[PDB]
Assembly symmetry: C5
Homo-oligomer: 199 residues x 5
């Protein structure tokens, strides 16, 4: 079995293009609003960012490789999408191992846990209505012609939100948007995390 | 005796050469045993609900690919090597708020039965409300550790004891430990069909 | 299978393509432009201000040109900025190493032009005295090559005005003006100076 | 003359360029401390921050050469990544140690290696009494992380911490600094475990004659 | 052709460091840009400066006529040997602010000028007075004695022409002295450049 897996990895990409486009499914699990800094208007979130895509170049017949259906690999061994927060104020801090799971249908699952500081005015967090902040996520360099974005849900997963956080969540959504600018033909997709929260 | 030193060096260089794994799978699963030694609660931040711990995390597992016959290598029964030279499990704190900081050399002990012992010392900031730390009852917080990417079918996560080792806890810490346990749990996450085991550190502590 | 032939055509283009840097005999022009997104922090105890901006860099190399007809009508591609030469554009009065906020990926076009737009957070030398007033404070930071003179790298801009169309509307600081004039100082030394006037919102 | 020396060194390094010690091939590592500053004592977390230079010396037969075969070269400098180095560690640090000096060692023709990293360390210390005439006392143990005294035999040249470079205008005055060597034995196991413990007694410079 | 000549030069060119019988002279000088912060709770002061370093290697020499008149080039500092110049009383690792690129000239000389931010041991008592505070920090090789690295200055006057005019701290004087210490047992001398700065709020 080990030899079959090693042989699979040895047998097993310049990224997508207009002629070979890719869809990335994105979802957030929001774990904690750690800090809300009203002297700089930065808020700090901890979340898990679920990323999934599929490549034909990663497919294999399991019967040809000892009935292996999936395996774990360094995210450095594979191409990964350049999904970026568009209004961060510090480099994102990676909180989980940089490992992805590849399946024989060519699909890749990668779920980095991250701490993010982003631009957010927390005025109102000390009130019943709370504060509201938003941050857009998408590719930094690819348009909708190379990378399209999808979600499995428009509701952020709050099932792991820390119940004794300094801040409680009033709502958290991850709506996808496809923006067409008047100037260009390409669509520009994003997924926007919108969080309403209070002390 | 200078020659003897030369021969044991040669035998070790040859063993390491001969030995130097793709990770576990449903069909080649791995048991990883975890144990914690809590050394210090450094800081409790009630403005962000983050607590900072220093601990040693004992990890051990066994690989057939790391076994050897000592009689073929000058009766070498174990050796030390950089953790970079070997596969290591992706044991992760599930509720950290900053990347974990490693305090010790990343070096493992490999024994001729293929067992590996790796014990990194770490400083961890994790989600924890310290309300009550200034009382006789104290505060109580938990943090889960487990593989980030391997389900229970690939890595089986065990302990040797339900008790966190406090015998090296810093006696002049700002915080005294009232109790510390490390029980196992099996959890279904929304991403994935398969169950993931963890070891959950539960710590009750108060200002000294 | 068309998708598969485009992948192979791109792999072949990148192999075919993969420059010692400019010289006095082979000089390079780098176009710079700034998009200011946020004034995060102004520290009056140290006279350091913190900016987040996107720095657009463009240049063109003959060694990166290709014929699209020979590579499947491929007119451009994305590639890691480590695969290519990049200019050593530096803030001249930073007080902390610049922090990169965006993937280090450039777009190369068939005519040999390159576009690279790193988002950055920068602390730089700036006295915010007067930021708590209607007139606000004014600060400046120069950007340019660290090691090349004007003989090897000349700098251009496409505009004298900093792009504020993405400036954070609920920042602690509002922008009164932001300009990016080019300045020249045996060899000439060019820079692009970011001058910002700002005040507490 | 310079060129022949440079050639001879390139040839020596190529000729020369160890799996670490074992019970059958133990290594003596000599340790010493030069304490340069107590920077900060934090009574809200019981952490104290030190700057020191940690001298490490050991000797390998595999690094020996005859100076006569290499143009009389008797010493050279090399990246400490180019060689094995011992896994000497503070046993009660609270942050990763920060290395302040270049990671370069000096190798001598008898096979001896000298490596002296300057370091900033945060470690567990209750500074109670630092604002009094008697001062505070902290201690931090240094030793191998994974090797017993039967693999790494830890020694010192002196029990005295070198204070000759202690910063004269530090916020903290040093009352004493020792580096005594200790051995610990477990009934289970035949191996003895050595450490060198840095013990520092210090006070706020304004606490001396404080009234 | 110019590019081919440069790529040939660098391929022809691409040092184990000095020894007693192959000593190297390193010339050092400082451009002081800012005193950012003076922390009287820990007696640490934070400087931003540019550290000019120059040395010469016979193994980096070439004939400009054999290489198309090329007289110098830029190269990553990781491509060449560089001296281990270190502050002797830093309290945090130095932070590099500029690209790590050096200029190599056909005579074998190398010029390398890193911009750095340095926290060092310094009591700022008196900085709030007319007389100011005075602090000093030594710079030199960590691991080489004067038998291997001979340290020199071109001048003892610290370059203040780029000092930030709205710093929280004004410079009363800055001097870089070529200093050494010798232990009577032994022939080796241990040189340094002592940077002495007198400053005030
Ligand atoms: C214990 N970790 C949870 C808290 C969150 C993450 C799970 C995970 C992360 N990265 C890849 C991924 O991928 C898989 C693909 C196929 C089958 C199973 C998992 C799973
Ligand atoms: C959605 N993107 C923003 C938040 C800004 C950053 C854009 C960018 C950065 N680097 C290259 C570049 O290049 C492209 C060329 C053509 C089409 C799209 C982008 C684009
Ligand atoms: C534009 N940056 C300045 C404000 C400060 C630094 C200049 C510099 C840094 N590193 C090498 C060096 O070398 C060269 C040699 C000859 C001509 C030009 C520069 C120059
Ligand atoms: C000028 N440096 C002091 C402030 C501290 C460090 C010295 C040092 C560090 N690493 C090796 C060592 O080794 C050498 C052996 C012989 C002669 C010179 C040094 C010396």
């Amino acid at each position: 079995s080990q030899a079959n897996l090693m042989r699979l990895k040895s047998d097993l990409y310049p990224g997508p293009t207009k002629d070979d486009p890719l869809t990335v499914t994105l979802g957030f699990t929001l774990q904690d609003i750690v800090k809300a800094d009203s002297s700089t208007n930065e808020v700090d979130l901890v979340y898990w960012e679920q990323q999934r895509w599929k490549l034909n170049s990663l497919m294999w017949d399991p019967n040809e490789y000892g009935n292996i259906t999936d395996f774990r690999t360094s995210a450095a061994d594979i191409w990964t999408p350049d999904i970026t927060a568009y209004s961060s104020t510090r480099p994102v801090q990676v909180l989980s191992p940089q490992i992805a799971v590849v399946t024989h249908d060519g699909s890749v699952m990668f779920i980095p846990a991250q701490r993010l500081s982003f631009m957010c005015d927390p005025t109102g967090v000390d009130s019943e209505e709370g504060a509201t902040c938003a941050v857009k996520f998408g590719s930094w360099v690819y348009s909708g012609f190379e990378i399209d974005l999808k979600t499995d849900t428009d509701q952020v997963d709050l099932s792991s939100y820390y119940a004794s956080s300094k801040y409680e969540i009033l709502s958290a959504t991850q709506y996808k948007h496809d923006i067409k600018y008047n100037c260009c033909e390409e669509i520009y997709p994003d997924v926007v995390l919108v969080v309403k929260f209070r002390e």
